[PDB]
Amino acid sequence: MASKKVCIVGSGNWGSAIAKIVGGNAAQLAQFDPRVTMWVFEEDIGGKKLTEIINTQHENVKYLPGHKLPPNVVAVPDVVQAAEDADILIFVVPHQFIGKICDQLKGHLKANATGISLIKGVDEGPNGLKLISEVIGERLGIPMSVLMGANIASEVADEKFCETTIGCKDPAQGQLLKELMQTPNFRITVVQEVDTVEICGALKNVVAVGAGFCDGLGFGDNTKAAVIRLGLMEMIAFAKLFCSGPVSSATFLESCGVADLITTCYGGRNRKVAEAFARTGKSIEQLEKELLNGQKLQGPETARELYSILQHKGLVDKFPLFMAVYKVCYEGQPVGEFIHCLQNHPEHM
Amino acid sequence: ASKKVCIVGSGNWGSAIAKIVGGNAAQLAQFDPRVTMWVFEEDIGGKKLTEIINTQHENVKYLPGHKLPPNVVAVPDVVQAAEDADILIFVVPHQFIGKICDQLKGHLKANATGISLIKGVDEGPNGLKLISEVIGERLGIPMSVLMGANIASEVADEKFCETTIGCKDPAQGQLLKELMQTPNFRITVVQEVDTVEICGALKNVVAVGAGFCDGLGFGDNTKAAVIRLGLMEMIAFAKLFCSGPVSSATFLESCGVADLITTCYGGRNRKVAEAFARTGKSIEQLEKELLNGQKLQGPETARELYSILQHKGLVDKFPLFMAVYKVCYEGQPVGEFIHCLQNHPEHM
């Protein structure tokens, strides 16, 4: 008869927007315990501890400016303590933290704890492509779902209408996650093809990096719309080859696909840094420190992992858009040469 | 012999196309370098518009900041502009296709072929009727279409973009590709003509919706959703009412997803819709103040779609399309737009 307890593992820009949504729904819905924990990697802010400011001011202005968090969301600095009693864990931490967090939580979760990942990126390893949700699911021994959609955090925090896609193999779990996260302005469509929904989130960032390049070279909407289109073609082709199980084009018409591509190529961080990289000579790394609190962008890292994955099978040449993004970010290909990967692009794949 | 080309239309899009066609024709032997452009005559400062184009090689009223290739000839009479053409490019405002078709009937070369660049559907013939069909039937010529993410100003600037040519005959399609392709205007030829064309018409309805949302203060997550739900209604609407085979795949060509993005982000239909939502000025007044009185196609097409669905009592079936119609013609406050998105069906 107990309500489900929810832990939000992460507290950045997206984790915070999510805390806002989850906090308000947990308090509004009986099936969820009003107390929502949020694991916050402790920080020093003017001599005050971040978690103390959050639980006192009820805001995380450093990562989510201009918004309060509902009072029932409690910032907890120790991940084990944050996640321990949770029945539902929402993974929304930067890719570089996942390994240690799981490998901190392993064996300390509730018996039938459930998981959902919001991280956009991929992992690799012998065999090739490895989904981040499967890595978390396996180390922690829990069932996993994903949430991926056109969700620039600052707009979600403002309650501007938008949608998202939840990938989940279990219908009841899927319905529970929808009840947990949906609001009148954050609409959710649940689909069962988890792997494709997840790969969409990872890949859309590579295409967004290339759209930022063209932005930095001075191009407009006709060009960006073409980057998105060819980028969508390579994304569907890549998923059919590397995703295990059934993969359908149709899934790319969900928010996780065509829409996240559009919103990310127009207003995401990967695009912004790609543009500045095109106009300034600064490296991706330095721009991240300069524009994104030193946060690791996943667009480039994913292109790097795709390069490796395509290299093992000898397919690098079949993904000119993905590979030009890779070469510009890692191998000094001049950004000014970007258009050539669109100019001779295969017509269909 | 080399093919003679006539560009029937000389507006924003028509003029940018003349740049492309005039350049390719002068550089390719299979196309006669003399390209005629039918220009509906106008008085600009006590001068004829055609004499100005032919004298200064620019049509700045419609395509500001660019010259036209010297070999493109503005011809005020359509029969004369077209009589000798082997390839006719139709790119005139919807309202003029009727007159044009009645003047040209019976005055074309026997083997003339056409290609339509007009984005709209036919007004009144209840049951969806394609404009390229209307033209092909009245003039008795084989038809193709060119549809893509092509804001004219960017094309005129030679910024890389793509486009889709819908042509059933393989050799005609390659010939049209040779005539229109440029290092910066890449063409993919497909045979599914009707689907390519309907894409161009419906994408403007969604774009009006996008502008409404911009005029209500929304950003990218919302525009992305309007594009996503719009695409969904586009695919379903085409499978439901288009004759012959319609495939989802065709919607991934420039005519579908890309043209929808570029129009919702920088099209005239988006701009005027946003101004409508914000100022309260009529559609007609905004056209007059931003489109030289040219009738915007987004609303017109929505009105046709409403005609087709209301007669079948299928109005709730296409929420986004009908929200655009209700706001444009039934007085529905623009502030009620978001509702058609919040209740949208998850699949169609």
From Swiss-Prot, chain B:
Q: Which reaction does it catalyse?
A: sn-glycerol 3-phosphate + NAD(+) = dihydroxyacetone phosphate + NADH + H(+)
Tissue occurrence: Expressed in liver (at protein level).
GO molecular function, one example?
glycerol-3-phosphate dehydrogenase (NAD+) activity
Residues recorded with modification Phosphotyrosine:
Y325
List where the protein spans the membrane: none
**What's a GO biological-process term for it?**
cellular response to cAMP
Q: Which InterPro entries match?
A: 6-PGluconate_DH-like_C_sf (IPR008927), 6PGD_dom2 (IPR013328), G3P_DH_NAD-dep (IPR006168), G3P_DH_NAD-dep_C (IPR006109), G3P_DH_NAD-dep_euk (IPR017751), G3P_DH_NAD-dep_N (IPR011128), NAD(P)-bd_dom_sf (IPR036291)
- Tell me which EC number(s) this protein carries: 1.1.1.8
Any idea which residues bear N6-succinyllysine here?
K288
Q: Which UniProt keywords apply?
A: Cytoplasm, Disease variant, NAD, Oxidoreductase, Phosphoprotein
Q: Provide the positions where the record notes the PTM Phosphoserine.
A: S153
- Can you say where in the cell this protein is located? Cytoplasm
Sites where the protein binds NAD(+): G9, S10, G11, N12, W13, G14, F40, F96, A152, R268, K295, Q297
For this record, an example GO cellular component is:
cytosol
Describe the family membership recorded for this protein in Swiss-Prot or TrEMBL.
Answer: Belongs to the NAD-dependent glycerol-3-phosphate dehydrogenase family.
Q: Which PANTHER family match?
A: GLYCEROL-3-PHOSPHATE DEHYDROGENASE, GLYCEROL-3-PHOSPHATE DEHYDROGENASE [NAD(+)], CYTOPLASMIC
Oligomeric state and interaction partners are given as:
Homodimer.
The record's function comment reads: Has glycerol-3-phosphate dehydrogenase activity.
Clinical disorder = Hypertriglyceridemia, transient infantile: An autosomal recessive disorder characterized by onset of moderate to severe transient hypertriglyceridemia in infancy that normalizes with age. The hypertriglyceridemia is associated with hepatomegaly, moderately elevated transaminases, persistent fatty liver, and the development of hepatic fibrosis.
Stored NCBIfam families? glycerol3P_DH
Tell me the protein's name.
Answer: Glycerol-3-phosphate dehydrogenase [NAD(+)], cytoplasmic
Q: Which organism is this protein's natural source?
A: Homo sapiens (Human)
Gene that encodes it: GPD1
